[PDB]
Design a protein around this ligand. Structure first.
Ligand SMILES: [Zn+2]
Lengths: 261, 427, 94, 27, 886
């Protein structure tokens, strides 16, 4: 009648992904963890662009949409930042937002590439991921001579349930039962199906023998980050966020039971 | 740049041998030219153990971390060179190892312990990879038979924690079977359990629970320093104990032969035998292997000091549950002298309060269990009413009131038991 | 601005002896001379000091403290006079 | 009663000295 | 979590069952101990008050017990009004038991609600109730509130008076009701009115219980309210000499003992005279012993100087010196000894011998009986004769002689105490040591195995007094002692303690042999390395004893051999260093001894390099390389002095003796540096009026006496050879280079901090800020630390202020040099620093923790914790700065 006792084994930790295994937990818990990975981990992304000048071939909505999709370093600042709707300031403030400024003027005969280096932050720790001190820079717009782009952008806190620009993950690879011992999927011809990366069978075998008493455990993960958060920070903030949602639901349910009874 | 300076200063110390190892002292103080100091302490050895073992043990195991890292990097870089003073050090240490190996004499066992901990320090910090002859002689020194002194207990403890720490130095079935026959010889020995048996039992519990993380902490605490172990090296070590050496039956039979922690309290920290006994009673291992735990529980309860260890109350609770579960019947504390004599020679007040807590919790478990037992008439085995007259319950809770802060939750639980069971004593 | 209310008891000449010291968390120990206009005298041997002392520093990463203390000055040095009192200060960036 | 008697006033037993006593006493 | 545990024991108090509810209530003090947070203690106390208001009387009693056990935490609740109001609501209950429990709550809460007038009114109303438990609880609450509030006390004094002379009040409740007047120490007129009431009360109710309780509360009022003391003392003496009951006299005796322990300076000569007259004409030894205990307490204070020929106190001390009771004899001897060592008048010369022979008679009476009460009087007598020997030096010979004659004819358990006495005497007067060596050695010989339990303590104490008595070495006595231990004691702890005493007193060959005998007895290799290092240190200090006189070649040989053995010892000592209790002081002391011996050897090499290596071809200057050599030697010896000083400052846990030893080594190397400077480098600039005022040479040890004798001799030689020769002199090198020999001739003493760790204290220093801070912002170091007292917290010194020094060094210089003297209030301190980082890059900052004791001495003890700070720039600020620069 009680809780699981889940164990964690991490097989690969990199600045771009974490590859770990969760055992002795339920399928619903693992899937909700994956869903919070994609949708409910808060990061900082641009959500307010004031265009002052745009002579480029791309219109203002296009530039704003591209600026929103630029990932920003969000580690240990997204926890301090409040949501913009929850903060009591009139305009934006440092306690709920990060201000960005871009001002590029093309005066040369060569094409000017407006990149994420031109996005200038007012916070030293919320910067574009490609501007971290190898990889090239995210191109925003290309400018010919005479064209300019002056804008003021404000970057706030949100999660991927609202908009995919706040999704911190690139690919959340998720697996369970790699040898199909549970027969949760049924291959018409199991011989022509390639082995999983986590498969524990020989070349002569095609799938494990059927286990009638089995349940899904030993869930395999590969959480690739977009660079906005460290992948370990993605997993830790996902667990904290799911815990917080459950605790908030506990609080409201306790109030509702107390008011009804 | 280095060889010329080393030769010049070795010649200078040959010219002035009185201040020769003062230059070794300046080598250590300035953290320059480690091989020169090694050559200085090697060239002037022409009782005790030796000066070289003290010197490099002090380098690797000293308070100064800079000197430790400096000497470790020296040995690590010297390993990569083709087989030069490092090899002279290793040959001298090896011929020092054969100087005491036969078991061992009762006066050479401490020397063997010091040499063995030196090899610990080398293979832990320096990254020294021992040779085949070095590993064979070292493993021959592991399986020696000390005269079962406390020095011998320290010797076998260090040898066992090195088998745990460095499982990469066996690599052969013959040294494997020599190791396990030495382990079986140490297990069947009786005078070692007076300690080493606590360590054996605790690592057996940790492999049965598949912890393999505080195993590293126990090895580091016994050796007195931090070593990277890479627990995949201990994977073959786990299967030796789990399937062959420390089975559940022999660890359960060993759980009663280990002595109790005398005068245990919250001051005595760390993982104690009481925790392992509590873990075994949680898994009902003693009834599953027909081993009597009543004597050990009574002996542990009879020796307790004035701070209360947090594990004592859950241990008593699971012991009472083990008595009254329908899985089997652990024997309760006997109605005579081990309870009547215990509540009269000069037993501790915490012992009396713990026994009173056990008795009252046994009474509530009996009254909450007979509604659904339906097993046997001898299964309850209720205490006599004449026994409870010799128990000064109000008096004992009166002393327990005055020492509330010295008890964890014992005074609270005793108050709850008194209020539920004896409301006439709560007026 | 920080307002103080000092209950000076049995001070012979509080107009020219009682001084306010503000001590920032760094080495700054700015000493403030109150004007004689706000040394109120509600009784014999009783005095009231109501000054609006002024505090400023650049940005802090956390609200540290500030140390406010009354001092007595004499004709060449100054000595502690009142109980040391800590006030929390948070200079936020512009 | 010497004020500087080391063996006397052994109520303040240390950690190293206590272990040394336990090791060199029963031997 | 704290709030999780609070909810875990909060859910139990609506269980309905009284057992789980009292469970929930009495778990609260453990929660208060674990989580001392005011916002949480507040909520816990408010719900405890709520369950007090709604619960039954047993739950209310549990809340009362919790409140009594949590008195220090209830000052930090700060919602006082509603908490006290919901407790106070059930003062109106018709149940007298509930009213009594609430009165006990109010008395328990009286520290945080003084001047709370409804509580005062409830106590006053409940004092007149008809239920005994409610009246007793009201008395308890009145006793608590009178201590914490003077406005309660002024009216309740009149009320308690009127209900004491009210005869409807029974005698036992009167007895409980008298000690309310103890807390009348608020106003002088209040204490005067209380004293008038007590004076009427003692004569109004002359019962023995009434006079005991009234006299004790009168004296507690007189001790607390200090302007009552001479009349209280004279009242006590009057009741001691006139009231015939033994219990009243016994309270008068113990009460005058309390007043003499508290305020002995306020006793007049008439009070001491009256107490002495009481002790003369009493027929009971049980009362005379107590009176002499009071007079012996008074004798050790300045009351004797206020008292002062042959007076009644002297005659009483002489009479009680020869008494069949051992306690009366001990007290009379203590009074005689205190009078003798207090002053130097002509009259005490007669009673000096009286004190000596009374001491000897008490020794011959208290030695052969082995009673538990006899050992206390023996300790008193031996402490008294130690004080007699130290305070007055000349008569110590007879004291030592009677101890030696008593040693051969006394029981074993008495012999440890006389060995301690003889060692305490012999460390202060060294001329008495060598004359008593033969008898003590015979006593060591005649032990054999004629004991089983006190044999070990007697062996170590008697070997200790051999080592103290023998200022020189041992030739055959060492072999006889070795044979005695080998035949008798296989317990290696006795051998270790005897070797420890040998290395303490400088008998290093004996220590070397005993440490060789001990290397096979240990279990851990750590103690093996420690014992081997001790053996090598003792061997090296024994090798240093080969310096006969003036022979610099043999000096070089002996110093080289000692250095070889001694840093072989430090090679084996740092192997014994542990993560838990490292050998830090031992390693630093041995390293400093190595450096001092090496500097001595280098200086003797420069002595030889005067005559060797002749001066250069030059037509101070024109002296050759030797001028720079003594310059380097002076620099090295001054650096050694500074390092001995910083070892002194870093110890903080040593004795007075170990600190004195470190100071002696520092003075030794300072003496050598000054001897270089004053007669090689610049005799004209140096050699001022450095006449040390050698008056009372209060040197506690023989080693200290030898060191200051050597210092005085060397300083006199330097002053006598200041400008008598040219700076390139053979007499200069000879006198300095023989000063080396005189300094090294006395053996080194290893003190107690080298062996035993007492007063283990440290700073945890858990600071809270590679961390990164913006260039424009200033970093805030919220640094906090907790001290860790081990066993005795203030055995030698106590922490008064924790001086924290923090500085920042860029490019991981010292520009943020800051200092704050914070005071720990509950063995914990917290302060916050403001560090500025204008230069971008990695900033290494370090924080120190100096401790200033009660005397004002700075002890550099705390850890040097370092954290690295990176000064990263804002991208907008960086762009603005580059645009402004370009
Ligand atoms: Zn905001």
């Amino acid at each position: 009648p009680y809780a699981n006792q889940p164990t964690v084994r991490i097989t690969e930790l990199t600045d771009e992904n974490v590859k770990f295994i969760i055992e002795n937990t339920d399928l619903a818990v693992a899937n909700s963890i994956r869903r919070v990975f994609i949708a409910e981990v808060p990061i900082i992304a641009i959500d307010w662009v004031q265009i002052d000048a745009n002579s480029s071939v791309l219109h203002d909505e296009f530039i704003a949409h591209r600026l929103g999709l630029i990932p920003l370093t969000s580690d240990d600042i997204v926890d301090k930042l409040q949501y913009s709707r929850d903060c009591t300031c009139e305009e934006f403030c440092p306690e709920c937002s990060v201000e960005f400024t871009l001002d590029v003027r093309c005066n040369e005969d060569q094409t000017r590439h407006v990149t994420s280096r031109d996005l200038i932050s007012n916070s030293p720790r919320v910067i574009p991921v490609t501007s971290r001190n190898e990889q090239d820079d995210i191109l925003i717009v290309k400018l010919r001579k005479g064209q300019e782009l002056r804008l003021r952008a404000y970057a706030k806190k949100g999660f991927g349930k609202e908009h995919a620009k706040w999704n911190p993950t690139a690919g959340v690879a998720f697996e369970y039962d790699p040898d199909n011992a549970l027969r949760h999927t049924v291959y018409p011809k199991p011989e022509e199906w390639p082995k999983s990366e986590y498969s524990e069978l020989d070349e002569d075998e095609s799938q494990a023998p059927y286990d009638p008493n089995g349940k899904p455990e030993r869930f395999y993960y590969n959480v690739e980050s977009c660079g906005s958060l460290r992948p370990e920070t993605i997993v830790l903030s996902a667990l904290s966020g799911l815990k917080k949602k459950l605790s908030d639901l506990q609080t409201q349910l306790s109030h509702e039971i107390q008011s009804d009874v | 740049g280095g060889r010329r300076r080393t030769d010049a200063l070795r010649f200078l110390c040959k010219m002035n041998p009185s201040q020769a190892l003062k230059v070794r002292g300046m080598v250590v103080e300035e953290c320059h030219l480690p091989g020169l100091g090694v050559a200085l302490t090697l060239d002037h050895t022409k009782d005790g153990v030796s000066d070289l073992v003290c010197f490099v043990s002090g380098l690797l195991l000293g308070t100064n971390a800079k000197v430790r890292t400096w000497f470790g990097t020296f040995i690590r870089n010297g390993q990569q060179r083709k087989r030069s003073v490092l090899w002279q050090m290793r040959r001298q240490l090896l011929l020092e190892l054969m100087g005491i190996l036969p078991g061992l004499k009762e006066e050479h066992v401490v020397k063997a312990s010091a040499l063995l901990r030196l090899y610990c320090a080398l293979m832990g910090i320096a990254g020294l990879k021992p040779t085949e002859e070095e590993a064979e002689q070292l493993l021959q020194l592991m399986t020696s038979r000390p005269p079962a002194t406390p020095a011998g207990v320290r010797f076998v403890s260090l040898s066992f924690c090195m088998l745990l720490a460095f499982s990469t130095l066996v690599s052969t079935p013959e040294q494997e079977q020599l190791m396990v026959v030495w382990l079986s010889w140490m297990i069947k020995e009786e005078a070692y359990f007076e300690s080493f048996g606590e360590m054996l039992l605790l690592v057996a519990m940790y492999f049965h629970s598949n912890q393999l993380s505080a195993i590293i902490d126990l090895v580091c605490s016994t050796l007195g320093m931090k070593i990277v172990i890479k627990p995949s090296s201990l994977s073959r070590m786990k299967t030796i104990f789990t399937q062959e050496i420390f089975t559940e039956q022999v660890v359960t039979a060993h759980a009663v032969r280990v002595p109790v922690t005398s005068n245990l309290s919250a001051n005595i920290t760390g993982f104690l035998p009481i925790h392992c006994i509590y873990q075994l009673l949680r898994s009902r291992s003693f009834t599953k292997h027909k081993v009597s735990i009543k004597d050990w529980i009574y002996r542990q309860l009879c020796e307790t000091s004035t701070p209360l260890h947090p594990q004592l109350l859950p241990l008593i609770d699971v012991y009472i549950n083990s008595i009254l579960t329908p899985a089997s019947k652990s024997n309760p504390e006997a109605t005579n002298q081990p309870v009547t004599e215990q509540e009269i020679q000069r037993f501790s007040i915490t012992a009396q309060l713990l026994v009173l807590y056990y008795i009252l919790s046994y009474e509530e478990a009996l009254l909450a269990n007979t509604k659904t037992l339906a097993a046997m008439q001898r299964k309850p085995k209720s205490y006599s009413s004449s026994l409870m007259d010799q128990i000064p319950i109000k008096f004992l809770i009166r002393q327990a009131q005055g020492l509330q802060q010295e008890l964890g939750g014992l005074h609270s639980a005793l108050l709850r038991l008194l209020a539920t069971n004896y409301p006439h004593l709560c007026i | 601005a920080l307002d103080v209310d000092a209950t000076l008891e049995h001070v012979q000449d509080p107009q020219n002896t009682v001084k306010v010291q503000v001590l920032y968390p760094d080495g700054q120990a700015q000493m403030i001379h109150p004007k004689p206009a706000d040394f109120r005298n509600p009784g014999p041997g009783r005095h009231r000091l109501i000054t609006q002392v002024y505090l400023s520093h650049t940005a802090w990463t956390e609200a540290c403290q500030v140390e406010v203390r009354l001092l007595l000055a004499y004709n060449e040095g100054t000595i502690p006079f009142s109980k040391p009192v800590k006030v929390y200060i948070m200079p936020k960036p512009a | 009663x010497x004020x500087x008697x080391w063996x006397x006033x052994x109520x303040x037993x240390x950690x190293x000295x206590x272990x040394x006593x336990x090791x060199x006493x029963x031997x | 979590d704290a709030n999780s545990a609070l909810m875990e024991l909060d859910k139990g108090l609506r269980s309905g069952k009284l057992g789980e509810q009292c469970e929930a209530v009495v778990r609260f003090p453990r929660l208060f101990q674990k989580y001392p947070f005011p916002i949480l203690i507040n909520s816990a106390f408010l719900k405890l008050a709520d369950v007090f208001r709604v619960g039954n009387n047993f739950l209310r009693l549990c809340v009362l017990k919790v409140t009594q056990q949590s008195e220090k935490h209830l000052e930090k609740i700060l919602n006082v009004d509603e908490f006290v109001k919901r407790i106070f609501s059930v003062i109106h209950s018709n149940d007298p038991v509930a009213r009594a429990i609430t009165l006990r709550m109010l008395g328990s809460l009286a520290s945080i609600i003084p001047e709370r007038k409804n509580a005062h009114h409830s106590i006053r109303q409940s004092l007149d109730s008809h239920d005994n438990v409610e009246v007793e609880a009201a008395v308890f609450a009145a006793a608590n509130f009178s201590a914490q509030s003077k406005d309660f006390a002024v009216g309740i004094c009149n009320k308690i008076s009127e209900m004491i002379q009210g005869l409807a009040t029974p005698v036992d409740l009167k007895l409980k009701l008298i000690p309310i007047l103890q807390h009348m120490h608020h106003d002088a007129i209040l204490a005067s009115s209380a004293r008038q009431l007590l004076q009427q009360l003692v004569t109004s109710y002359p019962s023995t219980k009434m006079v005991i309780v009234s006299l004790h509360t009168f004296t507690l009022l007189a001790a607390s309210s200090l302007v009552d003391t001479p009349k209280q003392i004279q009242l006590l003496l009057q009741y001691l000499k006139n009231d015939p009951r033994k219990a009243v006299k016994r309270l008068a005796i113990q009460d005058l003992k309390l007043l003499a322990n508290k305020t002995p300076h306020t006793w007049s000569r008439e009070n001491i005279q009256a107490l002495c007259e009481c002790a003369l004409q009493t027929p009971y030894d049980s009362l005379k012993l107590g009176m002499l205990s009071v007079l012996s307490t008074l004798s050790g204070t300045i009351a004797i100087k206020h008292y002062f020929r042959s007076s009644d106190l002297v005659k009483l001390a002489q009479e009680c010196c020869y008494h069949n009771n051992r306690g009366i004899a001990a007290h009379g001897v203590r009074v005689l000894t205190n009078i003798t060592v207090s002053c130097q008048e002509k009259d005490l010369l007669a009673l000096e011998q009286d004190a000596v022979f009374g001491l000897e008679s008490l020794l011959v009476l208290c030695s052969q009986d082995d009673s538990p009460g006899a050992q206390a009087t023996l300790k008193i007598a031996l402490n008294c004769m130690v004080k007699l020997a130290k305070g007055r030096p000349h008569l110590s010979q007879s004291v030592v002689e009677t101890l030696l004659t008593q040693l051969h004819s006394a029981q074993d358990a008495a012999r440890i105490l006389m060995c301690h006495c003889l060692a305490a005497i012999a460390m202060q007067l060294p001329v008495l040591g060598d004359g008593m060596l033969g008898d003590l050695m015979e006593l060591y010989k005649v032990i054999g195995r004629s004991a089983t339990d006190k044999q070990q303590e007697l062996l170590v104490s008697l070997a200790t007094v051999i080592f103290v008595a023998s200022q020189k070495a041992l030739s055959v006595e060492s072999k006889a002692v070795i044979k005695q231990q080998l035949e008798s004691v296989s317990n290696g702890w006795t051998v270790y303690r005897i070797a420890r005493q040998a290395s303490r007193m400088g008998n290093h060959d004996m220590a070397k042999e005993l440490y060789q005998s001990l290397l096979t007895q240990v279990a851990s290799e750590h103690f093996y390395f420690w014992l081997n290092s001790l053996k090598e240190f003792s061997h090296a200090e024994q090798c240093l004893t080969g310096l006969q006189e003036e022979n610099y070649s043999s000096a070089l040989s002996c110093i080289a051999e000692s250095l070889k053995f001694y840093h072989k010892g430090i090679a084996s000592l740092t192997a014994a260093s542990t993560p838990l209790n490292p050998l830090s002081f031992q390693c630093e002391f041995v390293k400093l001894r190595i450096d001092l011996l090496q500097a001595f050897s280098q200086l003797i090499c420069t002595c030889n390099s005067l005559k060797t290596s002749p001066p250069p071809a030059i037509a101070l200057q024109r002296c050759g390389r030797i001028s720079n050599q003594m310059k380097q030697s002076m620099e090295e010896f001054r650096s050694l002095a500074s390092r001995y000083g910083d070892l002194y400052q870093a110890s903080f846990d040593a004795d007075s003796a170990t600190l004195r030893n470190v100071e002696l080594q520092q003075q030794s190397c300072l003496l050598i540096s000054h001897a270089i400077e004053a007669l090689i480098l610049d005799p004209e600039s140096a050699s001022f009026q450095e006449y040390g005022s050698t008056g009372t040479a209060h040197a506690d040890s023989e080693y200290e006496r030898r060191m200051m004798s050597v210092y005085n001799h060397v300083l006199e030689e330097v002053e006598s050879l200041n400008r008598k020769y040219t700076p390139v002199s053979y007499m200069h090198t000879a006198c300095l280079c023989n000063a080396i020999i005189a300094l090294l001739k006395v053996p080194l003493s290893f003190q107690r901090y080298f062996f035993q760790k007492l007063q283990s204290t440290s700073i945890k220093l858990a600071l809270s800020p590679p961390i990164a801070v913006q260039n424009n912002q200033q970093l805030a170091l919220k640094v906090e630390g907790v001290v860790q007292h081990g066993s005795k917290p203030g055995l030698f010194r106590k922490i008064q202020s924790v001086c924290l020094n923090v500085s920042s060094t860029l490019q991981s210089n010292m520009t943020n040099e800051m200092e704050q003297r914070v005071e720990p209030h509950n063995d914990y301190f917290s302060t916050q620093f403001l560090l500025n980082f204008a230069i971008l890059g990695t900033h290494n900052i370090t924080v120190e923790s100096s401790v200033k004791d009660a005397n004002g001495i700075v002890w550099k003890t705390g850890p040097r914790t370092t954290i690295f700070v990176k000064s990263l720039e804002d991208p907008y600020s960086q762009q603005i700065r580059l645009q402004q620069q370009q």
